[PDB]
Ligand binder design. Structure first.
Ligand SMILES: CC(C)(C#Cc1ccc(-c2ccc(Cl)c3c(NS(C)(=O)=O)nn(CC(F)(F)F)c23)c([C@H](Cc2cc(F)cc(F)c2)NC(=O)Cn2nc(C(F)(F)F)c3c2C(F)(F)[C@@H]2C[C@H]32)n1)S(C)(=O)=O
Ligand SMILES: CC(C)(C#Cc1ccc(-c2ccc(Cl)c3c(NS(C)(=O)=O)nn(CC(F)(F)F)c23)c([C@H](Cc2cc(F)cc(F)c2)NC(=O)Cn2nc(C(F)(F)F)c3c2C(F)(F)[C@@H]2C[C@H]32)n1)S(C)(=O)=O
Ligand SMILES: CC(C)(C#Cc1ccc(-c2ccc(Cl)c3c(NS(C)(=O)=O)nn(CC(F)(F)F)c23)c([C@H](Cc2cc(F)cc(F)c2)NC(=O)Cn2nc(C(F)(F)F)c3c2C(F)(F)[C@@H]2C[C@H]32)n1)S(C)(=O)=O
Ligand SMILES: CC(C)(C#Cc1ccc(-c2ccc(Cl)c3c(NS(C)(=O)=O)nn(CC(F)(F)F)c23)c([C@H](Cc2cc(F)cc(F)c2)NC(=O)Cn2nc(C(F)(F)F)c3c2C(F)(F)[C@@H]2C[C@H]32)n1)S(C)(=O)=O
Ligand SMILES: CC(C)(C#Cc1ccc(-c2ccc(Cl)c3c(NS(C)(=O)=O)nn(CC(F)(F)F)c23)c([C@H](Cc2cc(F)cc(F)c2)NC(=O)Cn2nc(C(F)(F)F)c3c2C(F)(F)[C@@H]2C[C@H]32)n1)S(C)(=O)=O
Ligand SMILES: O=P(O)(O)O[C@H]1[C@H](OP(=O)(O)O)[C@@H](OP(=O)(O)O)[C@H](OP(=O)(O)O)[C@@H](OP(=O)(O)O)[C@H]1OP(=O)(O)O
Ligand SMILES: O=P(O)(O)O[C@H]1[C@H](OP(=O)(O)O)[C@@H](OP(=O)(O)O)[C@H](OP(=O)(O)O)[C@@H](OP(=O)(O)O)[C@H]1OP(=O)(O)O
Lengths: 229, 229, 229, 229, 229
């Protein structure tokens, strides 16, 4: 079509997703970048969202709901071939799963036009609005050790979140060497600080392996009593 | 139709839901606002309920049960076209899922009349009665930290509830400023007050990160023994 | 039918359920009140049981098994119209789900008679016997705080049970004023008594919010040591 | 008629208004949710705005201004219209006040099309932009007692604003419990604090009834003079 | 005709208005008592409301708005009606201002029926809801003297409110003897108490005629300064 997305349009959409994630600003930008686009172009835009797999699953659920709504309003015709005309779209055709680009173009350019692109755009906008309201991406900054969480479990959660984090490898290494010790609970922080700089992750995990164990509990209790007595 | 809901009727229903939520007063108001309305108007009223999604799901379940009951009382005919007459309504037709507005008007104005609007209204009333009896909306005022609940889990619950709360953003900010520290458990509240005013949420979470850990338990036990000795 | 339930019969059944709940005395009364009644009348009696939803679900399950047994023993005929006679009942027809009142009267008054009312009555009697043996209604008197249960969870259980309780509103308020503090665990009961009369529920929950937390445990341990030393 | 508002679209619009009020975010959401909608659908969306009646009146004034502009640009055509042709829309027809849904659909689905829905959407967007720039909703947090304002007048303003506030009834009770005394002027606030907790609204009003009168002025002047010497 | 309001129905509505004023209970009650009634019966019910003329004016405004909306939905035809046919009702006809009882009956008893009574009752319900939400009746208990308000002006406000108050003459006299001095401002209250019991309204007004004047203010400053000396 005339309004097929240009290379700069697609790149702008990619950069919007990468920089803003799913802040409200994503909704206008998508609306502005995808106007006149076929459902195939919209699917191309959706497929370039790296990460946020849970958010994209949420979006797909919303699209399926809206497709079911469309199918409820549009009943399947009683098998009239109508060789002059073409088949009426279904919800899956609007979402582009069961329709080709030629069919979408034909629906968009027919008289009267069926703007399958704009209908799909509204479905996607509903999904994006739901994501913006509900979804919260994981953040490495939010990973803190629980007061009773073993240090190894905390480290596992930290590294899982770090793997999912959007950052360069150097930045992730820097995050490892600051946040991991920073966001440990006080009991493990004391041990890790006493361990000193240059301690490896294995040394750190060995040093905190007994926190919450009977011996460590006895030790800290006895130290507290000695201080207050 | 003559009794189609007016703009003021729809706005009054919206304001009723926003002001009273699902107090018993909702039941008369709905009854008064929806009399003579087609099932399409009733669905329009139901779609304007913002929030209370669990209550609306309960209402939908009740509507489905009543539609099944109607289907049990009304057997589908043995395919008599009856071109002079029209097809008999099903339960989904009364709820408006499988019927159009024209069909609803045709049933409502036929002689003898099938008041699909009134039947659907009674089903909705049953759902509303169930909601009024059972459903309790979440309240930010009810979020209190458990005696052994970690402060971060409490903060997550608080912010989830605040997100679901019906309030302006300034009011939500004021709620964060007061209720969060107010409704923490005594162990965390002692630390939070020791921090003083002006502490951020991150400083507050770091300060309470050790509550329940071995070191904090030893410290408070030692302080108690020193006081009693 | 000649033995259709009278207004006084239905009201007597309602009063029997309200006063006796599902004590064994319910089984004779039902038997006495429902003799000669159609399945329609029996369903009317079953629908007037307010509350005891779990017991009624048990009764429905028993009725379904008995209907399945009837269907096992009665095979569907090989489609003989038999215009002189009527269709043979199925289990669902005896339970009244798939049968109209006219069909039930026709079966009951046919020669030889098929006493669908009496068969359905025996199914209901089996269900009632099962309820009498197994089902135990929830009681506000039985709601007591566990030794380690947080006060807020106990209060939530108490208020849920109170909502399900069969009592006047004034009686429920009196129960709240007596049983809630009466049935708290000793640790919370001490604090609640120290509050004194006139404390609100919010002040009660605040006062017990720390029971089970480290500070409260340190306090009580130190107090016990001081008393024994 | 393919782009009619779905139940989820209308609910999303309602939630947008309830959550964001008239922050700038409302403008993209509206434009995203109303694409291809008829003027009737747009009016339905506008009627679901609960509260903000003054803002809605500003929007209606903007719409009337734009309709007047349209009428100035499009002069009426004297003489009967052609039987095949339809009447040209006026501003009121675009706004949906004097046009039925069928007429709007006919205008939109025509060769060449008159996009009455999109023109009306632009008018509504102008109104929303004016609201976002100028309208400021009343907030209970901004009700402060003036230095010379009688306490009763301040209480009246507080309760009017609280009635207008978008909040649950429990939240409104909490706001009364906190802000009313918190936001009184110092002269009334010292007396209100001297009253002590648990004071009723009538006791608070009678306690502050004399602030500003000759006796209170004489008393405070004498006390200040005694403090000085 | 069949559902015309009985004498007991009218009396029950009168008692409802007198006992509850415009509490929310007025809405279901009016809904129940007015079912099937003609616009003439509804107008009689509305005319039997004694007092609350501001609320009744609000109701009339709402009715006029709803009549205008109905007129917008129902364009005036050329009216070449057959002798058997009858003129289509307008908003004023539904409200009963321009329609006789016979015309309302004819619209209500017609094929297809035009339920003018029920449409009118919905308009009245919208007005009643507006009243319940917004209107607040004047209460003699709320009349308090302002801190700088002249005593004579307070007396005039009190007597105006007392004249408007719904109460027996003996209760009004008791109100005058109880609340007038009670709800005066502290300076006037001090003088009135010094005046002792048995003083008439003229002595009470003369005793407080100088409060806030130069002599009284100078006197109170002198007494306060002497007290703190
Ligand atoms: C060839 C081409 C032109 C095309 C096309 C093309 C065609 C159709 C669809 C599609 C559209 C709508 C539905 Cl409603 C379904 C469906 N409904 S269903 C039966 O329930 O699953 N299935 N499809 C797959 C279908 F149709 F092919 F079968 C779809 C896609 C979607 C676009 C899309 C991505 C998205 F994230 C969320 C959406 F809502 C829609 N892309 C996928 O679906 C693959 N995907 N899915 C998910 C997830 F599940 F996490 F959301 C994820 C992907 C991912 F991209 F890898 C990314 C990590 C996230 N693209 S091109 C140049 O773009 O390559
Ligand atoms: C075009 C128009 C005239 C129309 C129509 C229209 C037509 C039908 C229905 C509908 C009615 C009855 C059933 Cl019994 C089902 C059904 N039964 S089923 C197979 O089990 O799901 N499905 N539907 C969807 C159907 F029919 F379209 F398929 C329905 C709706 C409902 C109205 C409704 C809302 C509601 F809250 C609870 C109800 F009981 C009924 N609205 C929805 O359902 C969408 N919804 N649902 C839910 C939830 F699930 F949480 F309750 C929520 C929504 C929501 F509004 F977003 C809101 C957050 C809550 N509206 S208009 C101007 O209004 O846009
Ligand atoms: C019109 C009329 C003459 C009639 C009839 C009428 C007709 C049939 C049935 C019925 C009978 C037997 C089965 Cl075996 C099923 C079935 N089997 S199934 C597919 O598995 O669910 N469904 N039905 C619904 C059917 F038939 F309509 F489809 C039935 C009922 C039952 C009577 C009944 C009540 C009961 F408590 C326990 C029973 F075993 C049977 N009433 C309901 O069922 C509705 N109910 N259910 C339950 C629960 F689930 F908790 F037990 C509850 C209700 C409740 F009453 F609200 C109450 C809170 C409890 N009444 S009248 C004057 O009485 O109104
Ligand atoms: C039946 C249906 C399909 C329809 C329709 C329908 C049809 C037309 C109109 C309408 C549109 C444009 C103009 Cl320009 C005027 C007009 N211009 S005029 C002569 O100067 O007053 N009048 N109308 C009434 C008309 F047409 F009947 F005459 C309109 C509405 C508006 C939509 C609207 C709402 C709004 F808030 C602000 C707007 F700008 C437009 N809704 C109302 O107007 C009622 N309203 N008004 C106001 C206020 F004044 F405060 F802004 C308020 C309401 C309220 F919603 F109650 C809410 C508290 C606020 N809806 S449905 C399912 O939606 O019910
Ligand atoms: C024969 C008979 C059966 C009849 C009839 C009869 C016929 C019509 C109307 C009427 C109805 C609707 C509108 Cl919309 C207007 C209108 N619209 S308009 C152009 O703007 O003024 N005018 N009317 C007068 C009309 F029609 F004559 F023109 C009406 C009334 C109203 C009923 C009514 C009372 C009410 F309180 C509020 C309402 F909304 C409607 N009663 C009056 O109006 C007189 N009234 N009004 C007001 C007020 F203004 F405060 F609200 C007050 C009165 C009052 F009762 F004195 C009382 C102190 C309050 N009754 S009966 C019983 O008499 O024997
Ligand atoms: O408070 P309690 O309900 O009495 O539970 C405590 C305690 O839990 P707390 O954190 O709440 O104080 C211990 O937990 P830790 O502090 O050591 O993490 C736990 O000890 P363990 O988890 O190491 O087993 C101990 O269990 P126990 O006494 O059996 O060793 C258990 O006490 P009780 O089971 O006796 O209640
Ligand atoms: O008490 P306020 O309401 O705050 O105003 C007072 C004062 O009031 P009172 O006499 O009741 O104490 C005078 O008002 P009136 O005498 O007319 O009643 C006024 O005018 P005068 O100088 O003539 O006394 C005076 O002065 P000004 O308004 O110029 O400030 C002003 O004093 P303050 O504002 O400083 O309190």
């Amino acid at each position: 079509v005339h309004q097929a997305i240009s290379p700069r349009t697609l790149n702008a959409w990619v950069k919007v997703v990468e920089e803003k994630a799913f802040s409200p600003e994503v909704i206008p930008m998508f609306s502005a970048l995808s106007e006149g686009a076929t459902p195939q172009d919209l699917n191309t835009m959706l497929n370039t969202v790296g990460g946020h797999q849970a958010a994209m699953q949420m979006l797909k659920e919303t699209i399926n709901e809206e497709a079911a709504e469309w199918d409820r309003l549009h009943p399947v015709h009683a098998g009239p071939i109508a060789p002059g005309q073409m088949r009426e779209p279904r919800g899956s055709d609007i979402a582009g799963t069961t329709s080709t680009l030629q069919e979408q173009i034909g629906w968009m350019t027919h008289n009267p036009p069926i703007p399958v692109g704009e209908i799909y755009k509204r479905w996607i906008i509903l999904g994006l609005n739901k994501i913006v309201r509900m979804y919260s991406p994981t953040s490495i900054l939010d990973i803190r050790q629980g007061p009773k969480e073993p240090f190894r479990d905390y480290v596992d959660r930290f590294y899982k979140t770090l793997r999912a984090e959007q950052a360069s490898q150097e930045v992730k290494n820097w995050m490892t060497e600051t946040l991991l010790v920073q966001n440990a609970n006080p009991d493990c922080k004391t041990i890790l600080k006493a361990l000193g700089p240059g301690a490896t992750l294995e040394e750190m995990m060995t040093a905190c392996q007994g926190v919450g164990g009977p011996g460590h509990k006895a030790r800290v209790i006895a130290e507290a009593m000695s201080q207050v007595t």
